[PDB]
Amino acid sequence: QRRPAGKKVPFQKDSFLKQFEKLSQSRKQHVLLESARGGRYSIAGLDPIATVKGKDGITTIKHGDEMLFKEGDPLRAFHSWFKTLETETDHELPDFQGGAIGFLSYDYARYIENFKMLSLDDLETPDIYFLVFDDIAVYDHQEESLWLITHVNGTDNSADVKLSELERMWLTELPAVPSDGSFAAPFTEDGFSQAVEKIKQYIASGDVFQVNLSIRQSQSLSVHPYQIYKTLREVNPSPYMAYLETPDFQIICGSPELLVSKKGKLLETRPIAGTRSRGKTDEEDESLANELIHNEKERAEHVMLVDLERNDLGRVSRYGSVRVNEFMAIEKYSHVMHIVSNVQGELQDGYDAVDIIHAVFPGGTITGAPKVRTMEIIEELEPTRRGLYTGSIGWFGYNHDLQFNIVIRTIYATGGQAFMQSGAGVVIDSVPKHEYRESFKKAFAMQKALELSE
Ligand SMILES: N[C@@H](Cc1c[nH]c2ccccc12)C(=O)O
Numbered sequence: 001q002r003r004p005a006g007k008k009v010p011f012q013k014d015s016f017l018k019q020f021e022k023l024s025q026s027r028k029q030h031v032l033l034e035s036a037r038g039g040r041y042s043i044a045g046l047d048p049i050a051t052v053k054g055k056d057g058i059t060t061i062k063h064g065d066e067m068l069f070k071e072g073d074p075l076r077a078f079h080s081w082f083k084t085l086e087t088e089t090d091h092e093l094p095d096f097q098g099g100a101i102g103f104l105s106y107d108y109a110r111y112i113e114n115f116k117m118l119s120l121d122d123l124e125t126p127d128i129y130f131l132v133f134d135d136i137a138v139y140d141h142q143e144e145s146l147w148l149i150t151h152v153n154g155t156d157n158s159a160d161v162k163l164s165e166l167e168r169m170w171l172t173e174l175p176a177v178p179s180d181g182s183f184a185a186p187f188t189e190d191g192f193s194q195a196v197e198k199i200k201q202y203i204a205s206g207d208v209f210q211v212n213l214s215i216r217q218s219q220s221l222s223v224h225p226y227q228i229y230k231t232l233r234e235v236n237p238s239p240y241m242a243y244l245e246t247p248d249f250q251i252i253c254g255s256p257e258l259l260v261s262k263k264g265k266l267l268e269t270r271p272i273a274g275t276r277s278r279g280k281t282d283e284e285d286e287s288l289a290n291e292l293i294h295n296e297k298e299r300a301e302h303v304m305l306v307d308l309e310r311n312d313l314g315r316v317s318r319y320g321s322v323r324v325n326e327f328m329a330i331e332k333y334s335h336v337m338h339i340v341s342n343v344q345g346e347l348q349d350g351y352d353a354v355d356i357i358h359a360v361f362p363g364g365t366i367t368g369a370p371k372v373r374t375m376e377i378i379e380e381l382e383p384t385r386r387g388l389y390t391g392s393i394g395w396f397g398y399n400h401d402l403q404f405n406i407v408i409r410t411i412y413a414t415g416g417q418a419f420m421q422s423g424a425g426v427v428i429d430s431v432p433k434h435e436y437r438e439s440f441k442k443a444f445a446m447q448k449a450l451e452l453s454e
Contacts, residue, residue, distance in 0.1 A: 003087050004097045004151050004398070005159035007167065011146035013042075016139040020044045021226070022174040024245070031101045031131055031244045033395070035141055036237035037334055041094055042139040043395070045101050045131050052078050052100065052130040059128070073111045074128045075104070075354050082132070082396065087151070089399040094138040094147055095263060096403070100396040102130030102244070103251070103407070104361060106386035112358050113372050118379050122184045123414060125249075125387030130396070135162070137170055146170060151398070179224070181415025184384050187215045192439075193432035195381040202377055203428045209304060211368040211377055214423030215439045216384055223453045225250035225413045231453045232411075236334045236445040240405035242393045251388060252418075254409035254445055256333050259392045260313075260360045261403040267313050267345040267356065271365045273305045274298035274339035278332060289330040289337055301425065302328060302339045308364035308371065309343045315359040317345030335445070353396055363406045366390035366423070388412050389421035409445050420446040 017034075023046055024030040033043040050063040054074020061068040061081050070077045082100060090097060105127045109115065134151040148166040152159045187195070192215060199211045229243040229252045242253040258270040276292045279285040292298060306324060314322045326342035347356070367390070368374030378386075389412075394404030412419040422442035424435035 001154040002085065002151060004090055004093060004149055005156075005163060006090070006093045006097070006147050006149040007163045008143075009146045009148065009167070009171065010144065011139065012144070013139060013141060016042065016044075016137070016146055019170055019174070020137075022177070023169060024226075025177060025179075027245075029131055029246050032242065033101065033393070034233070034241040034243070035239050036233050036241045037239060039239035040140065040142050041096065042141065043096050043101065044137040044139075045133040046137075047133070047135055048131040049134050050132040052102065052128065052132065053126050054078065054128040055124070055126050073354070075108065075111070075357060078128060078130065079352065079354050082398075085132075085398050086400065087398040089264070089401070093149060094140060095397075095401060096136070096138055096395050097397060097399055098134055098136055098149055098151055099398045100130035100132045101394070102128065103388060104128055104357065104392045104404070105388055106362050106391045108357075108391065109362050109375060112361065113375060115375070116379055119382050119385050120184050121385045123385070123387050123412070123419065125385070125412070129246075135166060137166070181417070183218065183415065183417065186217055187383055189436055191383065192436050196426050196430055196432040196435050198381060199377060199426040200428060200430060203426075208374050208377060209369045209427070210301065211374050211426045212366050212390070212423040213378070213426050213435065213439075214382060214386065214389060214421050215436075216389070216419055216421045217443060217447070218417045218419050219447075219450060221413050221416055221418045225252055225411070225418075227453045228252050228411060228413075228418070228449055232409075232445065232449040235449050235452065236409065238333065238409065240393070242405070244393070249412060249414040251393065252411040252413065252449075253393055253405070253407060255393070255405040255407060256338075257363070257365070257406040257408065259363050259394075259404040259406050260356060262347065262356060262401050264401075265347045267317060267347055269309045269313055269343045269360060269363075270340060271302075271305045271309045271343065271363070272338045272340050273302045273365055276337050278335055278337060285332065285337070289332070292337060292339060293328065293330055298339060299328065301427075302341065304369050305365050306341045306343060308369050309341075309360075312360045312364060312371075313343055313345040316347055316351040316356050318348050321346035353400065353402055356402065361392060361404075362390055363392075366406055366408065368425075386421070390423075408442075411446050411450070418450055
């Protein structure tokens with residue numbers, strides 16, 4: 001009889017964000033998924049019922065005094081436990097009605113494809129990490145309402161008591177309250193350049209069409225990570241932002257990109273590929289958008305990545321159900337514009353959350369085409385494990401819905417350092433120095449956010 005029970009309250013976005021900051025201060029582990037520019041929902045998880053950590057074939061589920069552990073595919077280990085908490089969808093509640101919020105490391109891909117063990121794991125990022133929530137606050141930006149949601153079995157005055165405690169917590173103004181390690185070096189310029197030349201050799205030879213090659217920069221963290229998040233929200237607000245805090249690492253995510261969503265049977269992915277800086281004039285913007293959309297090399301790159309996503313979603317979709325409902329729109333983000341497409345499919349009966357992740361993860365747009373060969377080349381060339389970079393942050397619903405971003409425009413804070421990773425799409429005619437500089441430019445929002453925070 002397990003089901004979600006929710007209360008809808010009129011509420012202001014800024015009240016929600018301020019109350020989150022105040023409440024989260026007393027919580028060792030918490031997460032915010034924020035729609036800071038576009039998007040409908042912002043999701044606060046304060047008090048987890050469980051912590052799920054998977055690394056190198058071992059998964060731990062910490063739930064009160066109990067720590068459950070099992071070997072194998074960490075997501076399969078997670079799913080077999082998580083299935084016991086499954087619920088029916090309440091169509092009155094938001095898309096997220098309770099469940100797991102966290103991340104899949106890029107290195108979760110090692111359970112999907114056979115990877116060589118070449119790149120150095122110096123950050124020891126979990127392969128999966130989820131906070132599981134019966135109790136959540138979901139802000140609906142479209143209805144300007146706060147949903148407070150709990151879970152019960154059978155008993156319905158049980159629900160009302162818990163919802164009253166959540167109301168007390170969220171609708172009561174909170175008092176005025178007060179507020180090292182050694183890692184591998186970045187890819188050198190010479191190292192990156194020699195890797196660009198190696199990728200071009202593989203392209204010439206017909207192994208791949210395009211590879212995202214990335215560089216990991218780091219600075220000393222001199223301010224609280226949440227301050228960096230608040231700055232990034234100002235510098236570059238995005239529809240798939242996230243802040244996740246634990247004692248060992250914090251994540252400051254400014255992603256604009258959806259990897260995959262599932263609402264009932266409907267699967268969607270939203271590949272972004274092709275870019276220009278916004279104009280000064282908001283008419284310059286029309287002409288820059290017009291230039292981007294008439295640019296045959298950006299269109300070719302975009303169509304290639306849409307085909308790759310069609311094939312990925314096709315692996316778990318009813319035959320003939322995969323459609324591009326939105327093909328090659330320009331969408332203006334805070335400081336750039338992108339070519340963006342929307343790819344939909346109907347989930348074939350018998351495929352579950354793990355099957356969907358195995359089909360689409362990691363995203364085509366941050367590896368290359370074809371994906372499996374591209375990941376082999378990345379692993380051969382990049383000196384360090386990607387970890388969270390080009391992984392996915394999001395949620396698994398108890399009702400079997402899900403929603404994951406792609407981790408780009410993200411700072412990972414651990415061991416007194418802030419880590420910032422960005423890449424460039426290497427192609428047949430790439431100039432090593434151009435792609436090196438292009439990866440530093442992609443890191444601007446994040447180094448800027450850091451500098452402003454002091
Ligand atoms: N933009 C999503 C919610 C969201 C915000 N940040 C996220 C990060 C990851 C996944 C989802 C999200 C929505 O409105 O539906």
